[PDB]
Symmetry: D2
């Protein structure tokens, strides 16, 4: 089926056991692949502590009894390309204390000398500084902050990992429905960016397909209560409810279901698949009407 | 702006003053065009009676005081291409009494000798014999009946009017959102067909653009209480409510708003516009979530 | 273990040979260990069964590990029909249709329930449009409706009758071509329409089947493949020019072997895809993504 | 009378010459009788104002009836900025930026309210990506974000500041290129991304503006046009090859004169379109519809 044994993979955007990031890394390992991580500096120490402590061990369990193992947990700030781009505030920011080589370019180099060429690239990271504000209120600063962090980070990740990705390697990034249709509350220009992330998924499928022979795809995924989601009865608690009531599949959306899907797009089975936006959302993309609306009877 | 004076137009699917059919014909006339009609035989006598009586005269008023005038009200059954295709039941059906030349091919000929070559083609007609049944219940007979009447009718209309349409002429057909996203209640395979109607709108934009130089477009339009709609607190009464509560524009959807749009796609202003699906629906296509759902607070 | 289909049973409708995507799926459903059954269009069941019995297709029946794919049952199946009573005497007595019965959908679906019991997986790999070499402006109504009766509705009726016997969490997947959403000249006779209806009935059914049965429904929009059915379209094959176009214009510059879609389907029909429904998956080497042919005669070589 | 815009006032942001779609719209908004105002990128207001005052563009300013289009006001306007405080001393004192002030969005939007009062119509016809000759894999972050700051966000800020002064039923429309939804090679520097953000912010804003103000928002995805801005992309113009491609591959085999989109916009911004919002309209001679370039080197001539 899917033995990715002898393949190296890099997962960017993993700092806990709740994000989609984790899930992906978890299914990749379960298929035999070597799995590394890029983690946001400030929250790195804690993540490692979590791991070392042996408290994320229930989460690291392989359906056979093995515990996942990571080839490296790399400090990574996708807001930064090369060292010359990191401000002096940040360099001096306490929470970035005693870590270096965390810019995209830098990590890419570290991975090559540490692990060699790789096969798989996962992009699981976004940041909207004005996510809670409607577009009519989102300022330029936030909009661009929301785009730089959540969209260009991908193009830059490809730009630097691509040159060290084997042929037939694959790369995946996670988008949200708000990119295509209006989803109130997904403000701060996160929708705008997500849309750019999808376009770039296509545009890159072309540039990476031709230059490197590397497939590039996106998953538009459904509501999941990651820590990044929890931080906006919350906006995503209501999100989960809607999708549960209105989608074709009346079932819960687990971190994994995206991991599963991700595995695929990252496995040989998907050798013909590129520039695709794959809906892992219990089929809610397909509905053109709320069935539980207050406008129909109950 | 839009003086279609000296242009001949044919509108298929008009039997009352409530359908989108009417609206289109009404805006076309108001721009100076000659306007003919194709009307379902059984309901022809009555339509004419309505007109002659001087009771649809409030509906026929031009924003200047003139009353619309039609160059011809032609019997038309779009379920039938050429006379050899009409069963012996129908030929003998009382409601088709004392009318002939109502097959598509036949009407096309009648229009040419009666009016000459034409410029504009409007397609405003659909029929689902199992519209009220979910797809899992729709039988082959109904599905195909639903497709023949509502989709192929267009391709056949182009096939026969195309050869008598001037260069730069245009043709328009009306679709529903259910074609792209799942709209419960729009069963009987009407959704399937609508989707075929859109594809064919594209496919024909290509064949009619190249062979005849004729533009071909569709309007995916919002809920309107035509008589054809009323016949399914009804399924469309609830339809109108939903769209009113959930769309970007909180406003009523009048027959006209589609007529307006139609005028455009049929005017010179749209000389570069072909194969398009244009949403005249108060912007509800753009939402990816019910705002009045019972899942959010009120 | 990431994809394990042991204990699950699959029905792959539309398999007559070993060149079509259909084959590739049965082969991919089965290395995953699923028990696989087939529906073969009646007029060529003899020619197909014989290629099997004889060994001509042994080369195509080899899995990775080096064992041979076997089938739980080869079912006569005409997708144009639903019920014995739908069959016209024209055929009831067609020399090629002789030697077989119970080959309508409702009938197959019965025999499968008798023979194998509830299924978990269902594959719709078939289509038929008599006027496909004809442009839409030259396509007959009869021929158009036939295309749709064969390539689109068949999927519906196939869900209706195989639905009740499908396990919760079951999957079904149909096959489509890009012509549905954008004009591809030469792919005529209403097939482009028919596939569009299909993709939409895949969104609709995903909803209905997804609620009543808890079954998922999906479409794999595939690129061009030299199969018996393709080579029949229209010297230099119309299918060949397509394959050529793709090879020169798709992001991934590579051959499209059927196995590709084979593996693509396997995903969609597996536990891995248990949150994926109503989608159209482009297994086309990324060609869906392009806005321009790159080898245009308008552009520099 | 089917399209009458007498009494309505329009602001067309992004007009420096008489070749761009921008021009064509002001010209189409105005034959409809609307009073029209312009925003010109500061560095070329002199060259533009002078072409007007002189008469060089009289040939382009003639309407059907044979009268001349006049403007209610020509406003200095840099879309990269929102507020006086957003302006860096770099520019505050750029030789080309001298002789003008109050050229940020919030400022223009003020002066327009002072000078003309509430508007009904708003046109976003501008874009700027310094690295557009660069593929995405060679595009800088700074240059990418600039593209987006200039071509996409500008639209947002333009709605924010012109919103409150817009009448209920007002309209706004931006401009896009097919590159947003499918790869068009050569259209780089992040512009493809930027336009995608734009089309999406056109769906989003249509909702927000559509509720708060009752204003409609729409996008016209246009085909290639030889404008100053295009000819600047990259011998044989990159824009020329595009125009050529289209002429050979689009359903309607004809020239795309700017007036086309000119009239297309006029519709969207008029009472006729009062139920149309959040849409992307392809004014491209139907090229959006095609799945294959028909003059491929893979296909027979
Ligand atoms: N939670 C959901 O249901 C949901 C829904 C739709 C889409 N998504 C998408 O999935 C992806 C991951 O979502 P998640 O919230 O499950 O994962 P998550 O909660 O772990 O958050 C994403 C990770 O990216 C990290 N990150 C933020 N800024 C970074 C920077 N500049 N450099 C490096 N890392 C940075 C965050 O710390 C976080 O660990 C995101 O891109 C998001 O857009 C999530
Ligand atoms: N009413 C709405 O809100 C609504 C919504 C979405 C789409 N539409 C579409 O708009 C079009 C017109 O809709 P409407 O209901 O407003 O108009 P309508 O109520 O007048 O019905 C369409 C016309 O077509 C005629 N017709 C049916 N079968 C025919 C046949 N085989 N040959 C010739 N004529 C035939 C009907 O008699 C009717 O007059 C339809 O195609 C429909 O799909 C309507
Ligand atoms: N071949 C391609 O490049 C291509 C591309 C996109 C989609 N598809 C789709 O894939 C499916 C099959 O793939 P293929 O190209 O290998 O076809 P194919 O080579 O298998 O030829 C048709 C297949 O379906 C069966 N079939 C044909 N008509 C039938 C009928 N009316 N009743 C029952 N069975 C019938 C035949 O047994 C045959 O195996 C079709 O639905 C087609 O639309 C094919
Ligand atoms: N030209 C085409 O074929 C084409 C195709 C699709 C979409 N468009 C869109 O149409 C719009 C303009 O059409 P065009 O091609 O005639 O452009 P153009 O020829 O008018 O050149 C850019 C125009 O916008 C203004 N402008 C440029 N940068 C600006 C800045 N940063 N601040 C304020 N104003 C600025 C200039 O005055 C100029 O008139 C753009 O948004 C572009 O994306 C153009
Ligand atoms: C219904 C919402 C589903 C949803 C949940 C989480 C998402 O991811 C993020 C969202 C915002 C920020 C920030 N800042 C960071 C991340 Cl990782 C998302 O894109 C969409
Ligand atoms: C919410 C529904 C909006 C809606 C209303 C009316 C429509 O038109 C028809 C529908 C069914 C039949 C039949 N038989 C005939 C027509 Cl003219 C439509 O397609 C969609
Ligand atoms: C141009 C290649 C795309 C393409 C190639 C082959 C396809 O399969 C069929 C095509 C036509 C008919 C018929 N009749 C039957 C089948 Cl199984 C297809 O659907 C689309
Ligand atoms: C290939 C033709 C498509 C095309 C042509 C011209 C366009 O307009 C611009 C293009 C680039 C820049 C910049 N920087 C500015 C503008 Cl106004 C466009 O958006 C898209």
């Amino acid at each position: 089926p899917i033995d990715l044994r002898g393949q190296t993979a890099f997962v960017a955007g993993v700092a806990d056991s709740h994000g989609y990031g984790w899930a992906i890394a978890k299914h990749l390992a379960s298929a035999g692949a070597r799995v590394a991580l890029g983690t946001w500096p400030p929250v790195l120490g804690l993540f490692q502590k979590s791991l070392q402590s042996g408290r994320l061990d229930e989460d690291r369990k392989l359906p056979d009894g093995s515990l996942i193992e990571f080839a490296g947990v790399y400090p990574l700030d996708a807001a930064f390309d090369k060292p010359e781009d990191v401000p002096q505030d940040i360099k001096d920011n306490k929470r970035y204390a005693g870590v270096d080589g965390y810019t995209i370019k830098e990590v890419a180099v570290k991975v090559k000398q540490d692990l060699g060429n790789i096969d798989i690239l996962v992009h699981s990271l976004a940041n909207g500084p004005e996510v809670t504000k409607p577009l009519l209120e989102t300022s330029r600063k936030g909009y661009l902050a929301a785009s730089s962090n959540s969209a260009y980070s991908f193009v830059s990740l490809l730009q630097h990992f691509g040159p060290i990705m084997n042929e037939g390697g694959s790369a995946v990034t996670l988008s949200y429905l708000a990119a295509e249709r209006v989803v109130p509350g997904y403000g701060g220009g996160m929708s705008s960016a997500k849309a750019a992330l999808e376009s770039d998924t296509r545009t890159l499928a072309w540039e990476a397909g031709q230059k490197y022979g590397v497939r590039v795809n996106a998953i538009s995924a459904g509501p999941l209560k990651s820590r990044a989601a929890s931080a906006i009865k919350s906006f995503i608690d209501y999100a989960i409810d809607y999708s549960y009531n209105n989608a074709p599949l009346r079932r819960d959306l687990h971190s994994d279901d995206v991991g599963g899907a991700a595995l695929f797009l990252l496995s040989p089975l998907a050798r013909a698949v590129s520039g695709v936006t794959l809906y892992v959302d219990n089929g809610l993309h397909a509905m053109g009407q709320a069935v539980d609306s207050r406008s129909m009877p109950p």
